[PDB]
Amino acid sequence: MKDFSGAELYTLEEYQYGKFEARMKMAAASGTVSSMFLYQNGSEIADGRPWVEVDIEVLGKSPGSFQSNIITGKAGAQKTSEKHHAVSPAADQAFHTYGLEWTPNYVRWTVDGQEVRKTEGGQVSNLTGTQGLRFNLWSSESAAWVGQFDESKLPLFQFINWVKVYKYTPGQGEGGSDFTLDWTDNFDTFDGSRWGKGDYTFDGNRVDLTDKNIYSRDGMLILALTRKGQESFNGQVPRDD
C-alpha cells in the first residue's frame, strides 16, 4: 500500500552468537537507511517478549558514517544505544567490509577489520536467543534522524559482494581462537536455500520492502530503493578493486 519500494535480504536461519562479515557499497540520500543487522525475528511483536537486535545503519544524510545500535527492552519500550562511526571513503563511494562479532560477553563492530565499537556486558547480556543476519534499504519518516527524504535521488542501490558467517566455537576455532567459518556466499547467484527476500513494512518506514527490488547481477546481490512502479535495475555493478 505504500508508495515506495525498498528491499531486504535475510538469512532463513537464525544463530546464537557468531561473527558476520559483509563486503558492501551502501546506498545513501537524505532520508534513507541502508543496513546490515542481526535480528531476532518477532521482536517487533508487543506481546511481552524481549527485543533482540544489533544494527549497522548508514543514515542517508550522512554517508561518511554509520550508526551502530543494540536494541533490547521490548516492543513499545525499546532500550537503545546509538553511536556514530566514520567510514572513509564514504559508505556510498566505496566497498568496505562490515563486521559484527556477537558473543555472550560482547558485541564488536568492525570496518575493514578495525574496531569502531565494542560493547561489553549491559545490553549484550540481554541479547539472548538467536538472530538472523539481514540487510535492508528503506526510508524513515523521522526526518530528524535521517534527513528529509529527497525523492529526486531515487533510484538508489546497495551492493553486496560477498558474505562470511562464522560459528561461535569458544577455544575451538583455528589455532585456539573463538570462531570457525560456517559458510560463505559470493553472490554469483541468489541461493534460495539460504536467503529470503523481505515482503513487509512497519510504522515509520515510508516504503514496502519487496522482493521486486532484490537483483542478482555480475557477482553481486543488489538491494534497490525506487518509487513504486519504477522497480528496476539496468546499469552496471560497481567494481570492487
Residue 141 is among the residues annotated as catalytic for this protein: no
Is residue 120 flagged as an active site residue? Answer: no
Catalytic annotation, pick one of 14, 57, 120, 231: 57
Cβ 86 to Ca ion shortest distance, Å: 26
CB atoms under 10 Å from CB of 216, counted, come to 14
Residue nearest to Ca ion (CB): 219
- Return the number of the residue (24 or 116) whose C-beta is nearest Ca ion: 24
Q: Is 176 exposed, middle or buried (0-12, 13-18, 19+ CB in 10 A)?
A: exposed
If we measure between CA atoms, which residue out of 159, 163, 165 comes closest to residue 213? 159
Give 64 or 238: the residue with its C-beta nearer to Ca ion.
238
**Nearest approach, Cβ of residue 165 and Ca ion (Å):** 8
Binding region for Ca ion (CB under 5 A) = 1, 3, 126, 149, 161-162, 182-183, 186-187, 197, 199, 211, 219
Closest CA to 227 of 160, 164, 155, 138: 155
Question: Widest CA span of the chain, in angstroms?
Answer: 53
With respect to Ca ion, which residue has the nearer C-beta, 86 or 170?
170
Give me the least distance between CB of 146 and Ca ion, in Å please.
11
Discontinuities in the chain with C to N beyond 2.5 Å fall right after none
Would you call 84 helix, strand, or coil by DSSP?
strand
To Ca ion, the closest distance from the beta carbon of 162 in angstroms equals 5
Catalytic residue annotation: 53, 57
